[PDB]
Design a protein around this nucleic acid. Structure first.
Ligand SMILES: [Mg+2]
Ligand SMILES: [Mg+2]
Ligand SMILES: [Zn+2]
Lengths: 129, 150, 87, 184, 82, 206
RNA sequence: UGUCCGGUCGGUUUUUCAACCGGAUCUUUCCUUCUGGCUAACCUGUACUCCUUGUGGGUGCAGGCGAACCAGGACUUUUAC
């Protein structure tokens, strides 16, 4: 089966980056995926991206900037209790300074810093450094 | 990538972009429905009916022209069989396999195939039960399977 | 990088490839600076003025490098008819 | 038939529209008949950015089909009647919103009524007997969803000049910035 | 195909080449060939991959023999496209 | 950006056609090459000419951009084009390599033929491949004359051309030389076939 | 909170500005709904004026905006996070 569509997409993106492609084609194209992409854009890791309407599920194209290094996805969507966020960041991200840990929460799909600012955490999706 | 075999093909029907009607290809929805009903009465299964519609007449999909599918339409009318079509087919196949086995005691591959078919049927049956079409506490197996079939 | 109030720390602030963005390392023995001389009207290649491109080594290794260069040139305005958007 | 074929009839514009319809009916082969089985829920006016204007004339929805069965000719007639303005025979759609966790079950909504779905329907309507091939949606670096509509290259004579107007209308309806496009 | 493909708009040739599935949007390349038989002057909207011994509207003429893919149009028969 | 002057002269095009710079490549074809202009049937590919010309021009420009002239190391192993290479070298002072390349030429600072280029030029990256590899060890640009079956690994500015050979490679070389001359040199005009000849280059009768 | 001066007796109060986090709303939009308690308020206008030439300002009560709170129904899709 096609489990974690988002994860697959992320993997594809990573592969593309490794190759030195300037853009990616993604099949399934979810809400979560879209959110992630938006977040990335906000941060400054991704160019344009466009949702094709296959009169069906979806189909995204992402413009890679050459800035992404890894665009990871942590596997089961672990339940993060605000203090554990720091730990997670330490585990995943290079440096206290930079990078993000994209985690869904009540407020919306946001990065770790954003969540902290809000004062609202939840379940992790991925990361970007 | 296929349920039972290790053959991972994509022999598949594409479907067109427009959910709306393919303009020129005319007729009427009501007429189509009537035709479907007639087919059902005659004995054609939903898939078969659909195929018929496709082949000679100007229908592409019922989903497009009517809005409704075919099975749903049949149900509305009062024409969908007690056992859903695919399931029925599977049962028939199983029965056939059993018969073959009976005829020829020594046949291992055949037996295996039969077993597989049975398993498939069971799965399907379970699914149906979960849905609520076939009533619960009911196994569609082998001895009574034949009876069910005919 | 920027200590206290500016004061740029960390020298060697690297050449980043034109095609990939990918940082060109200190010992990236494969990466190359192409210099393309600036054109003028009726002959003339304007001495001491270039469009300079950096190509990372990975791309070169791949063989996706020439194409990339061509694309870059097209983007700039050093070519016509060569690199198409769609293939 | 002035304040009759309009569901509920208060406004001047509505009255004018009714009058126009009546005038059209005056001909009477089948057009009149068609008109007799057609009404407006309301009318809405959209200012297009560039001289012209757009008339989103709202239809019940059961009569939408009827309109379509006529439409183009009728639309043309309307245009002729009222110069310097485009007409869109749009459908008055409900949009029963999404219920919250705490909120009340209004015996469920239909997915026909879901906001996105409604928008899609509107789009389908608004662009003429012409038909959409597909839609791109561009999420830009700043953060702006731009819908980009691929139109089917057959016909494309009615839409040709109205694209900007249509986009404007869409924006007014929803908020989304639409753009139109035709492939070779 | 390398680095900067620019993936929203391919050349149509490529699309044609690739599987009826493996393009941007799914879109079939089967057609409703509007066949006319030699007998009666009436048009049958025959889907090109019949899967059936395609009779006329009533008369037993036999229009198309369903080969696995596209149907062989039985004998000297004439057809329009779509 | 560009002058919009050099749009491939008709005469030049004719010459190229005669050479059969563009009837080369054959059946065999590389995925990194969109220099084709329609496949001629049964064991042939036709090469787009304008594109090739543009590439050549670019190469010439690049060459010009190198300031010290005795620097542009031209190379040729395979026999058809060695002469052409030599001619080119003679025309524009840049120490060439006809015949054997010598491994450890651009690396290995002891060798008698220790060159140190800032711009390498090649004919067949299928054959001279070694040279290209060597260059890749020490940060040098590589210009090369690609047939559509030739590898373009560690290659830049790959002038597309027929490497069946005989006339074609030589012709290409000549063209390149001309371009170089035009971009800073004696020749101030794109017109006039001038005192040189193509047939100075080409493979000779042994 | 950084800014713009310390307007000040090393600390404080605004503006020229900021990003950041909320809140109300309006957008085809309900946030659970009512049977009643308090209707705070003026949407008011009943006498119209203590009064710089004024819509600066309030003694003031029949229709009535209820969120300013309760105190009882009605029945909650239920979780996990
Ligand atoms: Mg598969
Ligand atoms: Mg299995
Ligand atoms: Zn007949």
């Amino acid at each position: 089966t096609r489990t974690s569509v988002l994860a697959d997409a992320l993997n594809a993106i990573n592969n593309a980056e490794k190759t030195g492609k300037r853009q990616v084609l993604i099949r399934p194209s979810s809400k979560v995926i879209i959110k992630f992409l938006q977040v990335m854009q906000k941060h400054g890791y991704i160019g344009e991206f466009e949702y094709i309407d296959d009169h069906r599920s979806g189909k995204i194209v992402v413009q890679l900037n050459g800035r992404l290094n890894k665009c990871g996805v942590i596997s089961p969507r672990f339940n993060v209790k605000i203090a554990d966020v720091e730990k997670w960041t330490a585990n995943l991200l290079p440096a206290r300074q930079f990078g993000y840990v994209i985690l869904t929460t009540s407020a919306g799909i946001m990065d770790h810093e954003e969540a902290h600012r809000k004062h609202v955490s939840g379940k992790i999706l991925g990361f970007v450094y | 990538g296929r349920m039972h075999s290790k053959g991972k093909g994509m022999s598949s029907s594409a479907i067109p972009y427009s959910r709306n009607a393919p303009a020129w290809f005319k007729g009427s929805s009501d007429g189509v429905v009537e035709q479907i009903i007639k087919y059902a009465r005659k004995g054609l299964t939903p898939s078969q009916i659909g195929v018929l519609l496709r082949d000679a007449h100007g229908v592409t999909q019922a989903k497009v022209i009517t809005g409704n599918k075919i099975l749903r339409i049949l149900k509305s009318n009062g024409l969908a069989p007690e056992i859903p079509e695919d399931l029925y087919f599977l049962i028939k196949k199983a029965v056939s396999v059993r018969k073959h086995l009976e005829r020829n005691r020594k046949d291992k591959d055949a037996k295996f195939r039969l077993i597989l078919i049975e398993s498939r049927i069971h799965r399907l049956a379970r699914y149906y039960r979960t849905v609520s079409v076939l009533p619960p506490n009911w196994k569609y197996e082998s001895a009574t399977a034949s009876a069910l079939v005919n | 990088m920027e200590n206290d109030k500016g004061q740029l720390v960390e020298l060697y602030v690297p050449r980043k490839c034109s095609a990939t963005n990918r940082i060109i390392k200190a010992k990236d023995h494969s990466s190359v600076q192409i210099n393309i001389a600036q054109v003028d009207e009726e002959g003339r290649a304007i001495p001491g003025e270039y469009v300079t491109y950096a190509l990372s080594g990975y791309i070169r290794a791949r063989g996706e490098a020439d194409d990339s260069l061509n694309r870059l040139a097209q983007q700039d305005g050093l070519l016509k008819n060569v690199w198409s958007y769609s293939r | 038939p002035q304040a009759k074929i309009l569901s509920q009839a208060p406004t001047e514009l509505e009255l004018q529209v009714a009058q126009a319809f009546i005038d059209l009916e005056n001909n009477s082969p089948e057009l009149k008949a068609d008109l007799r089985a057609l009404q407006f829920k309301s009318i809405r006016e959209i200012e297009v950015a560039g001289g012209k204007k757009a008339l989103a004339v709202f239809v019940p929805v059961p009569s939408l089909a009827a309109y379509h069965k006529v439409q183009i000719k009728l639309t043309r007639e309307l245009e002729k009647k009222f110069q310097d303005r485009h007409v869109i025979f749009l459908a008055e759609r409900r949009i029963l919103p999404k219920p919250s966790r705490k909120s009340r079950q209004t015996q469920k909504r239909p997915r026909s009524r879901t906001l996105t779905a409604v928008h899609d329907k509107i789009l389908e309507d608004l662009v003429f007997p012409t038909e959409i091939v597909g839609k791109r949606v561009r999420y830009l670096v700043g953060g702006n969803k731009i819908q980009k509509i691929l139109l089917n290259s057959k016909d494309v004579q009615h839409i040709d000049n109205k694209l900007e107007s249509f986009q404007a209308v869409y924006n007014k309806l929803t908020g989304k910035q639409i753009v139109f496009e035709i492939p070779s | 195909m390398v680095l900067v493909q620019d993936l929203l708009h391919p050349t149509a040739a490529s699309e044609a080449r690739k599987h009826k599935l493996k393009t941007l949007v799914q879109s079939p390349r089967s057609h409703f060939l509007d066949v006319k038989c030699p007998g009666c002057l009436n048009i049958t909207t025959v889907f090109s991959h019949a899967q059936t011994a395609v009779t006329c509207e009533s008369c037993s003429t036999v229009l198309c023999t369903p080969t696995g893919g596209k149907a062989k149009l039985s004998e000297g028969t004439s057809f329009r496209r779509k | 950006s560009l002058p919009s002057t050099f749009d491939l002269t008709s005469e030049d095009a004719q010459l190229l056609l005669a050479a059969r710079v563009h009837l080369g490549a054959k059946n065999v074809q590389v995925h990194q090459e969109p220099y084709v202009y329609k496949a001629r049937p049964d064991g042939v590919n036709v090469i787009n000419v304008g594109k090739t010309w543009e590439k050549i021009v670019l190469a010439a420009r690049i060459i010009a951009a190198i300031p010290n002239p005795e620097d542009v190391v031209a190379i040729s192993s395979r026999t058809y084009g060695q002469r052409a290479v030599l001619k080119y070298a003679a025309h524009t002072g840049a120490t060439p390599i006809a015949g054997r390349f010598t491994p450890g030429s651009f690396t290995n600072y002891i060798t008698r033929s220790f060159k140190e280029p800032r711009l390498v030029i090649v004919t067949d990256p299928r054959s001279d491949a070694q040279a290209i590899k060597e260059s890749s060890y020490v940060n040098i640009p590589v210009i090369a004359l690609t047939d559509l079956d030739s590898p373009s690994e560690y290659v830049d500015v790959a002038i597309p051309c027929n490497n069946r050979g005989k006339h074609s490679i030589g012709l290409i070389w000549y063209l390149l030389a001309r371009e170089v001359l035009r971009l800073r040199g004696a020749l101030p005009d794109r017109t006039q076939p001038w005192a040189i000849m193509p047939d100075l280059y080409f493979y000779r009768n042994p």
